[PDB]
């Protein structure tokens, strides 16, 4: 049998939010001029210039 007391619930959630997927789209990403690019040792990747 349907019983109102056993069927009435309060459902809770957030009022509103926005889900995002492309996290890296929030990053501004530049690079140095390749002439000035350095390796792990902090010297230029190519040094013969």
């Amino acid at each position: 049998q349907f019983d109102f007391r056993a069927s009435m619930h309060m459902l809770t959630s957030n009022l509103t939010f926005t889900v995002y997927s492309d996290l890296l789209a929030f990053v501004s990403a530049d690079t140095v001029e390749p002439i000035n690019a350095v390796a792990f040792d902090n010297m230029r990747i190519m040094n013969e210039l």
Binding site: D30, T31, V32, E33, N36
Partner: protein, 49 residues
């Protein structure tokens, strides 16, 4: 050093110093405007650039 800043493209230090009104000297060959206006100086335009 403005040359180092242009080479590395890393603006964190200058951005922090400008946002915090931290006194600094930006060193490097720079073009400048010549302004003979007393009103412009009283308006403090040199601090707006």
């Amino acid at each position: 050093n403005l040359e180092e800043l242009m080479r590395t493209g890393d603006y964190a230090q200058i951005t922090n110093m400008l946002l915090n009104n931290q006194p600094v000297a930006l060193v490097g060959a720079l073009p400048f405007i010549t302004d003979s206006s007393v009103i412009s100086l009283v308006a403090k335009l040199d601090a707006t650039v």
